[PDB]
Curated annotation (Swiss-Prot), chain A:
GO biological process, one term: glucose homeostasis
Phylogenetic placement of the source organism: Eukaryota, Metazoa, Chordata, Craniata, Vertebrata
GO CC annotation: chromatin; cytosol; intracellular membrane-bounded organelle; nucleoplasm; nucleus; receptor complex; RNA polymerase II transcription regulator complex
Motif 9aaTAD, chain ranges: 249-257
Disorder noted: Defects in PPARG can lead to type 2 insulin-resistant diabetes and hyptertension. PPARG mutations may be associated with colon cancer. Obesity: A condition characterized by an increase of body weight beyond the limitation of skeletal and physical requirements, as the result of excessive accumulation of body fat.
Organism: Homo sapiens (Human)
Record's protein name: Peroxisome proliferator-activated receptor gamma
Assigned keywords, A-Z: Activator, Biological rhythms, Cytoplasm, Diabetes mellitus, Disease variant, DNA-binding, Glycoprotein, Isopeptide bond, Metal-binding, Nucleus, Obesity, Phosphoprotein, Receptor, Transcription, Transcription regulation, Ubl conjugation, Zinc, Zinc-finger
Major site of localization recorded for this protein: nucleus
Full protein stretch here: 235 to 503 of 505
Coiled coil: none
UniProt family annotation: Belongs to the nuclear hormone receptor family. NR1 subfamily.
Length: 257, 246
């Protein structure tokens, strides 16, 4: 029944609004220019030093440390959203942990696209905007932590998904029965099946002119997994080069693999 | 009129049956008898065996924590079936769930308790009151005030039809801190209260002032919750898992 799929799409959207304070709709209105919501822009070291006045160690390290703290808050938001996905909490506790461990970063890069356009990224709940050029201009190896995220984002954003869409897509990501170390693959796959059915109808209803959008979205999961693995490789470099740099426990446990 | 009140009661009963896998009726049958006996946990070896069938004290309290999170999702779903709830301001919904869940967890837990112990694992097991109370401090004191609450609550002899409305009344509390629009909430709760009153008059004609007696139990519930939070602050003085439970 179509109607049970619609109801589940509605529930997931509602949870998504409750779990994530900065939605794509809000991010786009800020980026577009929809007076009231105008961000301060950080394109250089002086603008960055100014940003601390009107927005909420070393500069490159201060920035990277900021991202990692933000990434932790995002993991908490994603974690709260996951608990809302029907069946998730009823799964074996080790599998819940495993789904989260492999899922959360893919979800982070998916939603981070919402806060990006080709020249920059929203920061600090959208009060600030840090330019893409400025992030590139960071001393090695920090120069190119964000670049693969921009490249993914520009392309992902051409799909034109809205938040209702994304709510379902991120649920589909989390409930992937091919995560390494899963004890009970079957219960997970049965939930994903249902979520995939919900996503399929949603995209057909919400984007009736956009052909094979469902398949086009699913193929993007290939791009997400690539971004994760490259980011891990970059993180291994940093720890060795910046022996004075402190990585957040949560994030360390996630990356253990 | 009275028929809108019956419509609402029935709507809530049907949703409560859909949302909660283990009903009071089903739990009473298993506690009195009616088919496999639940596996009983009365001792340490019993527990050890129970895990295979289906610090000990820490592992038991973590288990109640995991179940509590399951119950939050069941309660959340049920709340969405209450007429008016989804039309409320989003922040207010989250606020009503945030403060309402604990009161409901303990209300429904009474359903699974008698004076001698509590059903666990969806009624596949029975953990004895004595075994819970034997647990080293401060764990031994955690379940006991719930049992005390439950013996008195259960004396009202509510069924699932009654409880379904009562639960909704608890969710639509206008006095939760942080609420943005208290009006439509109180307005829904007034209507839920009307349904609860007529439900109790029809379902229990002989039980005088059962409605008032039930509302007085809200004092007992909030005290339990406040007392739980207190013991939880004490427990904090002793990774991805931490996050899930929060
Ligand atoms: C004042 C703003 C606070 C923190 C962000 C500041 C600069 C970061 C610049 C761009 C990033 C945009 C938003 C922040 C959130 C995620 C971006 C990141 C990403 C990753 O590279 C993951 C980093 C987590 C880690 O440190 O491992
Ligand atoms: C102060 C931290 C600096 C920058 C980001 C601050 C807030 C991000 C804005 C809103 C967050 C709330 C809900 C939206 C959820 C996900 C979209 C996102 C995001 C990010 O902020 C990027 C984090 C991604 C990463 O760490 O890679
Ligand atoms: C070990 C995780 C708990 C349960 C397994 C999942 C579903 C079985 C359904 C109910 C079992 C309930 C509790 C078993 C664990 C600890 C006992 C404690 C307490 C409670 O029994 C749960 C109270 C929540 C509620 O039913 O409202």
């Amino acid at each position: 029944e179509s109607a049970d799929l619609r109801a589940l799409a509605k529930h997931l959207y509602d949870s998504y609004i409750k779990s994530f304070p900065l939605t794509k709709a809000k991010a786009r209105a800020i980026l577009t220019g929809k007076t009231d919501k105008s961000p301060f822009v950080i394109y250089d070291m002086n603008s960055l030093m100014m940003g601390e006045d009107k927005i909420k160690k070393e500069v490159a390290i201060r920035i990277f440390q900021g991202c990692q703290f933000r990434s932790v808050e995002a993991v908490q938001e994603i974690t709260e959203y996951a608990k809302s996905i029907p069946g998730f909490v009823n799964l074996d506790l080790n599998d819940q942990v495993t789904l989260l461990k492999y899922g959360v970063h893919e979800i982070i890069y998916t939603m981070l696209a919402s806060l990006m356009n080709k020249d920059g990224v929203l920061i600090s709940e959208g009060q600030g905007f840090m330019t893409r050029e400025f992030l590139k201009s960071l001393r090695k190896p920090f120069g190119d932590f964000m670049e693969p995220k921009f490249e993914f984002a520009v392309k992902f954003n051409a799909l034109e998904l809205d938040d209702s869409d994304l709510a379902i897509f991120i649920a589909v990501i989390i409930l992937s029965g091919d995560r390494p170390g899963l004890l009970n693959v079957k219960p997970i796959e049965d939930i994903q099946d249902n979520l995939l059915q919900a996503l399929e109808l949603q995209l057909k209803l919400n984007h009736p002119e956009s052909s094979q959008l469902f398949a086009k979205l699913l193929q993007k999961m290939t791009d997400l997994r690539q971004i994760v693995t490259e980011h891990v490789q970059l993180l291994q470099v940093i720890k060795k080069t910046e022996t004075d740099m402190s990585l957040h426990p949560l994030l360390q446990e996630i990356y253990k693999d």
